[PDB]
Amino acid sequence: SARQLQREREAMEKSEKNRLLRARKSLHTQKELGLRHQKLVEDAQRNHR
Amino acid sequence: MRECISIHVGQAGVQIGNACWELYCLEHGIQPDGQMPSDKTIGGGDDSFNTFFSETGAGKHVPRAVFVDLEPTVVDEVRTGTYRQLFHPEQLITGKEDAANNYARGHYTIGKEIVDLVLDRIRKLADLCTGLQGFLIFHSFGGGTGSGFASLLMERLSVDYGKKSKLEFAIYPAPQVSTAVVEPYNSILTTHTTLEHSDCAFMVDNEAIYDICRRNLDIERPTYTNLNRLIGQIVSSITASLRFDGALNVDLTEFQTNLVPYPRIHFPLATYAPVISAEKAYHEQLSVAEITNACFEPANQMVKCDPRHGKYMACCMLYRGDVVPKDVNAAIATIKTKRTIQFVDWCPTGFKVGINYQPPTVVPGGDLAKVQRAVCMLSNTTAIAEAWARLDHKFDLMYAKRAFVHWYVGEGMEEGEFSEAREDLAALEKDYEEVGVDS
Amino acid sequence: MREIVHLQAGQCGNQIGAKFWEVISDEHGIDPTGTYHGDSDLQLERINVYYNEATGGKYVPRAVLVDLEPGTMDSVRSGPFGQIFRPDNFVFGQSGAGNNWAKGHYTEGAELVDSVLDVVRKEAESCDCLQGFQLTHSLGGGTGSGMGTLLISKIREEYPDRIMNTFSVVPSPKVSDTVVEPYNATLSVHQLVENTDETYCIDNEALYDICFRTLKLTTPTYGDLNHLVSATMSGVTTCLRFPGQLNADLRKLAVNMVPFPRLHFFMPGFAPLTSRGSQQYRALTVPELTQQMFDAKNMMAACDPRHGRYLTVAAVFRGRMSMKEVDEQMLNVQNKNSSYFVEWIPNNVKTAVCDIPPRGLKMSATFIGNSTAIQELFKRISEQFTAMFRRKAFLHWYTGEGMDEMEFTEAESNMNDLVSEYQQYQDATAEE
Amino acid sequence: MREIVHLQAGQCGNQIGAKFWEVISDEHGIDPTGTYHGDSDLQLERINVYYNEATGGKYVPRAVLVDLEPGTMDSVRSGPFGQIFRPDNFVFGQSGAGNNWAKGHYTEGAELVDSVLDVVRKEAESCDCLQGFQLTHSLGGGTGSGMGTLLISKIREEYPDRIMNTFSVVPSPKVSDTVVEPYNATLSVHQLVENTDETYCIDNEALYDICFRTLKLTTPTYGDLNHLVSATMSGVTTCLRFPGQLNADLRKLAVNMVPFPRLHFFMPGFAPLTSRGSQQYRALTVPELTQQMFDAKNMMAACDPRHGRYLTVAAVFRGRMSMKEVDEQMLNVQNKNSSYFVEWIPNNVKTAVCDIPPRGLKMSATFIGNSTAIQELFKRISEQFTAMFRRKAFLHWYTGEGMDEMEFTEAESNMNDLVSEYQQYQDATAEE
């Protein structure tokens, strides 16, 4: 019974690892966010000039 | 002759039957006492009331319906009503224990105890009738009484009468809103029974009713009374050519034969119109073409599904009230050339013409107005298969870790049926998409 | 027909049961004499659930009071409604429990248990068919806790097909009444998780805080707490006492509300807890009720439900409002507060509205929800039990009675297993 | 539907809010009891913006009072309308701020902030949809300034898509109430320019001068100032409260009157400020209103708008006169007074007339424009902050709280950047 419970807390650890994976995804998304803001500023200013 | 027996299982079935019977009595001028006391000023009643009622030697009308419920509270609620002098107490069987949204008890340990009584009741009712065509079974998938008891009774009725039509009318668990939690558990079991042992099944929900009432009738605090009124009007429209006549009478068999393309695909899409309030029926010119076009609108469908996702195979067209054939022909010519409406590449046309001279009536205290003509639509399309997909998804995500299953195991049943029902639903869905795929 | 047999244990249990009987008698229109003075409609048909039909329409209560101290009797009889009950049901001994669970179970639980078994058997045989047995007691002593568990075990052994519901009072380290209270609590929890269908959590400090910060009472006493728990019990039982459109029953709840038998605890709660001057300035509507029923301020535990995830929720209403508002409210709550309930199980809220409003108040609704908040109480109880059992303090009294110490060992092993199970089910992840 | 939630902070903020509530209750016909005694038409439809629908037609106010001293409660409640609000919203602590922004924000802004967030969240959830939140406070103390910035930051973090408009009181070297007022003003300016949508400038000395030289009052007190600010708020809010032909809302004004988010300050003002004996001798016309609306005598700031150039001007009228006169007046003003507005952007005046006149006065019109006059106040505040921070006087009190001195350095750096930006945008040349 305690071994099943320890399997389940290992599953807790696995859920934390899933959160880490989604955090990496979110890091990539926020990089793409810095990119849209950079493009929409600089290229539009080039067009303005 | 054209006589049928109605079956009401569960609280929803009982209240729907009450609404239908009261609609029939008000529309035929039948007094709640059971006699014809109108001896000073007559107001109707000289018609063919034999379809549903019965005429005695003293001028009494006895309803022909089955009001069975595992819980006695609903029976007591109806018994204390103002229509207790119309039916007979033998027709409302009470019970000690009920299912109350449970299939296990109501199918094995509760529904199996009262079988002989209801069987004798229905046998006596059938013997009292001469011509029998079909049955009106009213139950629910969410209610345990309307799922387990209904399944076990219809399984015996099918093997006792094969030549008689077997209809079905119940309520669908909405994907967005719901009443209980174990609704999919009973639904996944009742669908197999209604598919492999019945001929036709009509599936409706409540969220569409709420949407249409708030959009057209414009009510902020709805209630079950109008929900029952809509269903009763739908049923009356369906069985309109039986109590009366018209230019082209469409009996139960006449439409049921064509409404079933395949033994596995027998789930038509009902749509009633016009569903409007009193003010919505005064400054509004109503013709046939407009209401027919509106009938195909997804907003007016009682099932939340986009028809444009799939296409139509078989369609059943009905009318009730003062309708002119030229308008019907014009509407058919209009819809056959509409690019928005999708249909299979093999069936170029299909529909029926039911002309009912009797216009629909009104009720004092209801919300429906005096409309000169009505219309109901029973089409068959694959776009409604999404509901079964969502139900299967929910059942799968509830069955992975077996939530609320130990209760059913303790009650007594074999767990492989969940797998059996799941695979049967998967096969049925596969057949549905195979049919939906053209060449 | 369908009746409910009520049981009593513990002086606090006795007083709360008397308060509940007085409340229901007042609501259903019963004079203190014993006749009927009501003026309603549904107060005559299903009135036999808690009463019995006799000559002259004088309904009698159906409750057996079990106590070990005769001093509780004369107090509860001297009240305005203490002359209406059955003196035969008041079975009392001669020696007190002394806040001892083991001594009360062993000494005061052998020669006195026969009479209460005989009388409850007679009451059960007097009726045709029954649903369950309600016992109200407290864990702070040897009377309610030392005898209620044994009686529940006896009745489930005799009649397994009955509803075992109780409203025992959970202790609290901040507000304590017994030095050996953790020992009795640990002993009682084993029987509660082994031989009991369902159990509700009752705390006095939380009710005191509620009546202090919202009711704003001058001199709050145990009478107010008894009134509140009686109102809660009435709101729970109105589903069967007063049927409406969508009626429910105790067993349907216990089945749909308990995911696993090892976890059968709940958390009750009542909506309209307003101050005296706020009664004349209030808005009777659905969203206000949903908010006072969803927040942790009106709830009656000494813990925080926000620390875990909601498992099962039941919203029982008593009034005439609607059906759409409840479902839209729960839908938007689930959509917004997505990080407070189990994501694996959708639609964790049950709808229930009673068309018959209560007497004296138009709008009423109760909460029966099992949120992830009892883990803190369980872990603190286990920690204090281990702390006291390390050096084995206050143990010779239990040792002198005859029972050994391995019972404490098995009880604490069960507590560790249960708390580990609770903590591993708290963060129920969807997948790996 | 579309409702506005109102907030309160600071004793001066509390008194001005109470005055505004009394003014609007008298205007819309609300008795001190809580019922409705109005006789107009548009006073029932959109009345729910500041009130809430309840039983018996008794509307309740929607305002949360935030304070650190219980001595404001008895003052504001004993008045003729202090018995109509919601006592639950009146959240107070036990220790005063002591005119300290740092101590109030740290000590009195941690364990008390939770209650006000809970109540404002409940108020927001109670309604269907909202537009923004209105807070009236003052920079002269630790109550309004210490908490207003924090609550605005919290509401912006929780609900970014909301209107953040405030009416904080700017200080003045001539009329002072706090020795450390420059420190509090410098600290508050950072949050006002970082986490606030728009802010309006309020001065007491200029209002005193106005009521002395034009109103010619015998004993002008804070009540007159509260009445004037209440009238100005009502004139501002009548665009949504009382719709007319050309209605406007807060967000349209905030978008159209703010060229840059760093510059969101305004300059409010009311037109008909006449003496008691001049009321019966006056000619109500457009040019007189325009002149009293354009001159620097009637405006309520302690500076001169003629030192700079007008940036954004909005003329909101409340009456039944015209449209043509407004446009011709602004056209000829721009033609003549060409050296008072930015030539790079023509048509800087916005037209707004409310067809619904106010109760008690038939002609009313307010001024919401951003003129180049705050630069002097900003530069003098920066200078006084530099002088005080040079030798670090009155700093040990802030240091003992825990927060460091780098905050002052960054605040003054942002201060210098903001004033540099303001002065380099003042001389908005066409080209090189």
Side-chain angles (χ1 to χ4, degrees):
Chain A
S1 301
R3 298 302 74 73
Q4 309 320 120
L5 307 183
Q6 83 174 2
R7 304 284 81 74
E8 211 281 337
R9 54 89 192 170
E10 291 156 356
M12 291 305 168
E13 312 156 13
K14 266 70 162 188
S15 76
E16 177 64 25
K17 298 151 197 172
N18 312 334
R19 189 174 77 159
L20 305 177
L21 187 145
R22 305 182 192 278
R24 310 152 206 166
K25 289 180 172 176
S26 304
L27 292 167
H28 294 89
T29 60
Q30 58 83 19
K31 303 167 202 171
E32 198 267 330
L33 294 173
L35 287 167
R36 81 290 183 275
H37 194 73
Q38 293 144 25
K39 299 157 196 172
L40 291 170
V41 168
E42 211 288 318
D43 291 331
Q45 184 52 76
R46 175 76 273 168
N47 194 0
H48 198 74
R49 306 159 223 157
Chain B
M1 50 68 79
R2 299 181 295 183
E3 300 175 2
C4 299
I5 299 300
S6 303
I7 296 92
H8 321 288
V9 187
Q11 179 183 0
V14 163
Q15 65 182 2
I16 286 305
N18 299 329
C20 292
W21 278 112
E22 68 190 359
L23 179 59
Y24 296 155
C25 78
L26 64 89
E27 77 182 5
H28 292 289
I30 302 300
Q31 304 292 338
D33 57 1
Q35 291 293 142
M36 172 37 50
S38 306
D39 52 353
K40 301 179 178 181
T41 61
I42 59 180
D46 186 8
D47 61 330
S48 59
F49 52 91
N50 58 4
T51 65
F52 302 147
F53 298 93
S54 57
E55 176 66 23
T56 67
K60 302 182 177 183
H61 300 267
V62 181
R64 301 181 176 183
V66 174
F67 305 96
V68 296
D69 195 0
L70 302 177
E71 46 183 353
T73 178
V74 189
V75 183
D76 301 359
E77 179 72 23
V78 186
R79 185 179 61 91
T80 183
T82 178
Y83 297 155
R84 65 180 303 268
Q85 71 284 351
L86 181 59
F87 55 87
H88 196 276
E90 79 184 0
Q91 302 179 359
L92 275 70
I93 300 181
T94 60
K96 297 294 297 181
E97 183 63 29
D98 45 354
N101 313 333
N102 188 8
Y103 188 88
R105 290 178 297 112
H107 192 241
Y108 297 93
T109 63
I110 306 300
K112 295 187 180 180
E113 281 67 14
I114 312 299
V115 178
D116 48 350
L117 276 78
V118 299
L119 263 292
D120 297 332
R121 287 301 178 275
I122 57 153
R123 180 184 64 258
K124 293 181 303 177
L125 293 181
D127 299 359
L128 289 179
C129 298
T130 63
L132 177 59
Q133 291 76 11
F135 298 91
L136 302 180
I137 302 180
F138 296 156
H139 60 82
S140 294
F141 283 71
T145 300
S147 178
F149 187 74
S151 301
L152 59 90
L153 71 88
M154 61 79 71
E155 286 176 1
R156 295 178 179 85
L157 269 295
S158 180
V159 306
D160 297 332
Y161 301 92
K163 58 183 59 59
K164 302 301 179 180
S165 302
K166 306 303 172 58
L167 284 81
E168 188 271 347
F169 295 91
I171 303 301
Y172 186 74
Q176 290 78 23
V177 300
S178 56
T179 62
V181 185
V182 295
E183 311 172 358
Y185 300 153
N186 303 268
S187 300
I188 187 61
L189 317 188
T190 306
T191 55
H192 165 268
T193 315
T194 55
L195 175 70
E196 297 183 359
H197 304 80
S198 179
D199 299 329
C200 57
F202 298 82
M203 198 67 202
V204 294
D205 54 67
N206 309 97
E207 72 281 20
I209 305 183
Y210 296 151
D211 297 4
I212 62 180
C213 70
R214 61 93 175 173
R215 182 180 57 88
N216 307 329
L217 285 81
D218 303 1
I219 188 66
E220 66 285 348
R221 295 178 302 271
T223 184
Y224 288 95
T225 76
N226 312 303
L227 272 61
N228 301 12
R229 290 181 191 279
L230 264 58
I231 301 182
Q233 290 293 340
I234 292 173
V235 170
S236 62
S237 57
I238 290 177
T239 61
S241 300
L242 286 79
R243 46 184 180 271
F244 286 106
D245 47 354
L248 297 179
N249 300 331
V250 182
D251 203 0
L252 197 151
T253 308
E254 302 283 341
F255 86 93
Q256 193 273 332
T257 311
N258 300 270
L259 200 58
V260 185
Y262 292 95
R264 281 81 65 193
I265 302 181
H266 49 82
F267 296 89
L269 280 76
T271 294
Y272 186 84
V275 186
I276 51 179
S277 61
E279 182 62 29
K280 297 286 300 180
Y282 187 69
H283 298 275
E284 302 82 359
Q285 186 273 340
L286 193 141
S287 72
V288 180
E290 43 188 327
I291 61 182
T292 48
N293 300 329
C295 279
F296 292 90
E297 300 174 358
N300 291 318
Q301 308 293 338
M302 276 84 78
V303 180
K304 50 172 304 302
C305 54
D306 189 12
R308 299 182 292 100
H309 297 177
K311 56 189 59 59
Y312 296 95
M313 284 73 74
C315 297
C316 185
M317 191 76 204
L318 289 89
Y319 301 91
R320 175 182 176 181
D322 184 71
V323 56
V324 181
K326 65 180 298 181
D327 305 328
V328 181
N329 299 130
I332 293 298
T334 307
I335 63 180
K336 67 161 55 64
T337 60
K338 188 176 184 180
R339 307 284 80 86
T340 303
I341 297 300
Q342 304 179 6
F343 49 90
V344 289
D345 59 329
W346 53 75
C347 176
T349 178
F351 58 100
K352 289 86 179 184
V353 180
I355 295 182
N356 184 82
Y357 298 153
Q358 302 291 331
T361 60
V362 303
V363 60
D367 301 335
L368 277 297
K370 182 57 181 178
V371 176
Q372 59 186 355
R373 62 183 66 95
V375 61
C376 182
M377 193 60 209
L378 275 300
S379 61
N380 305 331
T381 183
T382 51
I384 203 182
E386 60 86 20
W388 288 276
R390 299 181 183 183
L391 188 66
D392 292 14
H393 300 168
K394 294 180 181 182
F395 177 79
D396 194 10
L397 57 86
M398 280 314 78
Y399 190 72
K401 307 172 183 296
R402 299 179 304 273
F404 299 98
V405 190
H406 62 281
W407 294 107
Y408 293 87
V409 181
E411 289 299 331
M413 61 79 71
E414 60 88 18
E415 311 322 301
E417 190 276 333
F418 296 102
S419 60
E420 175 182 359
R422 183 60 183 89
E423 64 188 357
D424 291 0
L425 266 295
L428 178 68
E429 289 180 3
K430 177 182 177 58
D431 304 358
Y432 263 85
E433 293 102 17
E434 290 293 337
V435 170
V437 168
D438 301 328
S439 61
Chain C
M1 295 298 103
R2 314 300 293 182
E3 299 182 0
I4 298 301
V5 178
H6 196 95
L7 277 299
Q8 288 296 285
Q11 45 89 12
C12 181
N14 296 334
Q15 64 183 0
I16 65 182
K19 192 63 174 61
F20 174 77
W21 276 101
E22 292 179 358
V23 162
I24 62 183
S25 305
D26 294 331
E27 290 179 359
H28 307 74
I30 295 91
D31 61 336
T33 301
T35 58
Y36 181 77
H37 282 61
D39 56 330
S40 178
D41 303 333
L42 283 82
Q43 292 180 352
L44 192 139
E45 179 184 358
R46 294 294 186 264
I47 200 183
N48 44 15
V49 176
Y50 294 154
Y51 291 151
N52 187 23
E53 176 68 25
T55 61
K58 298 183 298 181
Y59 298 93
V60 295
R62 184 180 297 268
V64 180
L65 184 137
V66 183
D67 60 329
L68 302 180
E69 183 67 22
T72 64
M73 191 46 257
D74 292 321
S75 59
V76 304
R77 188 182 293 272
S78 301
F81 296 87
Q83 68 282 350
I84 203 181
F85 294 93
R86 168 75 273 183
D88 292 331
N89 292 14
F90 301 100
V91 183
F92 55 92
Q94 302 290 339
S95 177
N99 300 302
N100 196 318
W101 186 96
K103 176 176 58 182
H105 181 243
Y106 174 79
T107 298
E108 288 80 13
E111 67 276 14
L112 197 61
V113 73
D114 306 327
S115 302
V116 298
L117 267 65
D118 295 330
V119 301
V120 301
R121 181 182 54 86
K122 176 181 180 179
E123 289 291 338
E125 293 179 353
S126 60
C127 183
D128 59 350
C129 179
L130 303 173
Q131 306 179 352
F133 298 88
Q134 173 54 55
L135 169 59
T136 59
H137 63 270
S138 58
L139 302 182
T143 56
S145 178
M147 301 301 299
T149 60
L150 176 59
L151 290 181
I152 293 298
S153 61
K154 290 303 180 182
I155 192 60
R156 59 90 187 163
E157 190 268 346
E158 296 178 0
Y159 295 153
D161 56 329
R162 300 296 170 86
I163 308 173
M164 295 298 102
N165 53 328
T166 179
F167 292 81
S168 62
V169 179
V170 298
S172 180
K174 274 73 59 178
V175 179
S176 179
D177 203 15
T178 311
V179 182
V180 295
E181 184 72 23
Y183 288 158
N184 302 330
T186 308
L187 295 178
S188 57
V189 166
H190 183 63
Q191 271 63 23
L192 293 174
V193 305
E194 287 295 333
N195 297 328
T196 302
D197 298 357
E198 61 175 356
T199 302
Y200 300 87
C201 301
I202 302 299
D203 184 75
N204 298 22
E205 181 181 359
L207 290 177
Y208 167 78
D209 189 15
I210 287 179
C211 75
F212 182 76
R213 74 181 170 181
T214 60
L215 280 76
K216 304 175 182 58
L217 305 178
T218 59
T219 178
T221 56
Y222 293 155
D224 299 324
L225 279 76
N226 296 14
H227 185 199
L228 270 295
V229 301
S230 304
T232 305
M233 187 66 203
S234 304
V236 166
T237 49
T238 187
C239 62
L240 286 176
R241 179 59 189 93
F242 293 153
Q245 196 279 335
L246 184 58
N247 61 92
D249 50 331
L250 303 180
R251 54 94 183 166
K252 169 58 179 54
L253 303 176
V255 167
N256 196 269
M257 187 66 203
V258 173
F260 301 93
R262 49 187 176 271
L263 298 188
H264 55 71
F265 296 88
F266 309 107
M267 162 45 67
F270 192 60
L273 278 298
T274 61
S275 61
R276 285 75 69 92
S278 55
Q279 300 290 154
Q280 293 80 17
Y281 305 94
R282 62 177 191 261
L284 279 300
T285 188
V286 181
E288 286 196 6
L289 292 182
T290 306
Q291 291 304 329
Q292 283 77 246
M293 294 298 290
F294 180 78
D295 68 329
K297 186 180 59 182
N298 189 92
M299 172 275 318
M300 61 79 71
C303 52
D304 189 10
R306 276 80 61 90
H307 298 172
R309 306 177 62 89
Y310 300 153
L311 308 176
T312 51
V313 175
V316 181
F317 299 89
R318 187 172 180 175
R320 184 189 298 102
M321 73 292 291
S322 186
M323 73 291 291
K324 180 176 66 65
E325 280 66 12
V326 181
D327 58 64
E328 68 89 11
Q329 280 292 339
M330 61 79 71
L331 180 58
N332 58 64
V333 159
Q334 290 182 174
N335 297 329
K336 299 179 181 180
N337 299 90
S338 180
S339 300
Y340 293 88
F341 65 99
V342 296
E343 61 86 20
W344 184 60
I345 306 96
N347 300 302
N348 300 268
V349 181
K350 181 182 180 180
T351 62
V353 179
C354 177
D355 301 1
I356 300 301
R359 180 59 181 88
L361 188 50
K362 182 264 290 181
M363 186 66 204
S364 299
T366 178
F367 196 74
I368 305 301
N370 182 24
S371 172
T372 305
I374 55 187
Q375 47 90 11
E376 189 278 332
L377 292 85
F378 295 165
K379 64 91 176 179
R380 73 188 181 186
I381 286 176
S382 179
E383 288 291 335
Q384 66 183 358
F385 184 81
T386 307
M388 295 298 102
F389 193 71
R390 194 195 68 87
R391 207 180 288 185
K392 300 181 178 58
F394 301 90
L395 195 58
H396 66 278
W397 292 105
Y398 298 151
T399 311
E401 302 300 326
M403 281 54 77
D404 50 7
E405 73 286 345
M406 61 79 71
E407 301 185 5
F408 301 94
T409 70
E410 65 182 0
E412 69 92 12
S413 182
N414 292 132
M415 298 308 107
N416 294 15
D417 176 72
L418 288 178
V419 300
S420 184
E421 179 262 339
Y422 202 91
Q423 66 92 10
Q424 59 85 28
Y425 277 165
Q426 176 266 349
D427 193 335
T429 179
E431 75 267 13
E432 61 176 357
Chain D
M1 50 90 70
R2 314 299 297 184
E3 300 182 359
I4 298 300
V5 179
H6 194 96
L7 276 299
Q8 287 298 284
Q11 44 90 12
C12 182
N14 296 336
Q15 65 181 0
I16 65 181
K19 190 63 174 61
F20 173 78
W21 277 101
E22 291 182 359
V23 161
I24 62 183
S25 302
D26 183 71
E27 194 281 329
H28 308 77
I30 294 90
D31 61 340
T33 300
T35 58
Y36 181 78
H37 282 60
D39 57 331
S40 177
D41 303 332
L42 279 82
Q43 292 180 352
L44 188 153
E45 177 186 358
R46 293 294 187 266
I47 201 182
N48 46 15
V49 176
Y50 294 154
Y51 293 152
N52 183 24
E53 177 66 25
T55 178
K58 299 180 299 181
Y59 299 92
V60 296
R62 184 178 300 270
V64 180
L65 195 141
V66 185
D67 61 332
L68 301 181
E69 185 68 21
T72 59
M73 295 296 172
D74 50 4
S75 60
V76 304
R77 186 181 300 269
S78 302
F81 297 84
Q83 68 282 350
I84 202 180
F85 295 92
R86 165 77 274 183
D88 293 331
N89 297 13
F90 293 88
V91 183
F92 61 96
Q94 301 291 337
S95 176
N99 297 303
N100 195 319
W101 187 96
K103 174 175 54 184
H105 183 243
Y106 172 76
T107 299
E108 287 80 13
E111 293 77 11
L112 197 62
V113 69
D114 306 327
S115 302
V116 299
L117 276 69
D118 293 330
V119 302
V120 301
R121 180 181 57 88
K122 181 179 181 178
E123 291 290 337
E125 187 67 26
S126 57
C127 180
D128 196 11
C129 183
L130 302 176
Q131 305 179 354
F133 300 88
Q134 173 54 55
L135 167 64
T136 60
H137 65 270
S138 60
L139 304 182
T143 55
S145 179
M147 295 298 102
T149 62
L150 179 58
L151 68 91
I152 289 298
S153 60
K154 297 292 103 180
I155 197 61
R156 187 166 186 172
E157 189 269 346
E158 296 180 0
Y159 294 152
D161 56 329
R162 297 297 172 89
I163 307 175
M164 272 68 79
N165 56 327
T166 178
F167 294 86
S168 65
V169 177
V170 297
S172 178
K174 273 74 58 178
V175 180
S176 177
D177 201 15
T178 311
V179 183
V180 294
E181 183 70 23
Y183 291 156
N184 297 332
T186 307
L187 294 179
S188 59
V189 159
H190 179 63
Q191 274 60 23
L192 285 180
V193 306
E194 286 297 333
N195 299 329
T196 301
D197 296 357
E198 59 178 356
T199 301
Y200 299 82
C201 301
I202 301 299
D203 181 75
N204 290 318
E205 180 181 0
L207 288 176
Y208 166 79
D209 190 14
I210 288 177
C211 74
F212 182 79
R213 73 184 170 182
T214 59
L215 280 75
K216 302 176 181 57
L217 304 179
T218 58
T219 178
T221 59
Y222 295 155
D224 299 325
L225 280 76
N226 295 14
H227 184 201
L228 266 297
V229 301
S230 305
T232 304
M233 300 325 88
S234 299
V236 166
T237 54
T238 188
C239 61
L240 283 176
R241 180 60 187 92
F242 293 151
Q245 197 277 334
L246 184 57
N247 59 92
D249 60 355
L250 303 179
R251 54 100 181 175
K252 171 58 180 55
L253 299 177
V255 167
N256 203 267
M257 295 298 102
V258 174
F260 302 94
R262 49 187 175 271
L263 298 188
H264 58 72
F265 294 90
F266 299 103
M267 172 46 227
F270 191 60
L273 276 299
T274 59
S275 62
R276 286 74 67 93
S278 57
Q279 301 291 156
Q280 69 279 16
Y281 304 107
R282 61 177 195 263
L284 279 299
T285 187
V286 181
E288 286 195 9
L289 292 180
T290 306
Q291 289 298 330
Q292 279 86 70
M293 186 64 72
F294 178 79
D295 69 328
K297 186 178 58 182
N298 188 89
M299 51 66 78
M300 61 79 71
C303 47
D304 189 10
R306 278 80 60 91
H307 297 173
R309 308 176 64 91
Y310 300 150
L311 304 177
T312 56
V313 173
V316 183
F317 297 89
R318 188 172 180 176
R320 185 187 295 102
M321 72 291 291
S322 169
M323 73 291 291
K324 184 173 68 65
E325 273 66 19
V326 183
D327 60 64
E328 68 89 11
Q329 281 290 340
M330 61 79 71
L331 178 59
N332 58 64
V333 158
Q334 292 181 355
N335 297 327
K336 299 179 181 181
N337 297 90
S338 181
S339 299
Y340 293 90
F341 66 97
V342 287
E343 58 88 22
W344 189 257
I345 299 96
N347 303 121
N348 302 268
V349 180
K350 185 181 181 180
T351 61
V353 177
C354 177
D355 302 1
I356 303 301
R359 178 63 179 90
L361 187 49
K362 184 262 289 181
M363 321 285 258
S364 301
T366 179
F367 190 81
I368 303 299
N370 183 24
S371 172
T372 305
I374 58 183
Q375 47 88 12
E376 176 183 0
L377 293 84
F378 277 99
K379 66 100 184 178
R380 72 189 183 185
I381 286 177
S382 179
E383 187 277 330
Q384 66 186 359
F385 186 80
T386 307
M388 295 299 106
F389 195 71
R390 193 195 66 85
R391 207 180 289 185
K392 299 182 177 58
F394 304 90
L395 194 59
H396 67 278
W397 291 104
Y398 297 150
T399 310
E401 300 298 327
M403 285 190 283
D404 47 5
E405 72 285 346
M406 183 278 288
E407 300 184 5
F408 301 93
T409 69
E410 66 179 1
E412 60 87 15
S413 178
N414 294 131
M415 187 66 204
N416 296 14
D417 175 72
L418 287 178
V419 301
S420 65
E421 177 264 340
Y422 200 91
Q423 281 76 246
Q424 60 85 26
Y425 278 168
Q426 179 268 352
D427 56 329
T429 177
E431 53 184 354
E432 295 67 21

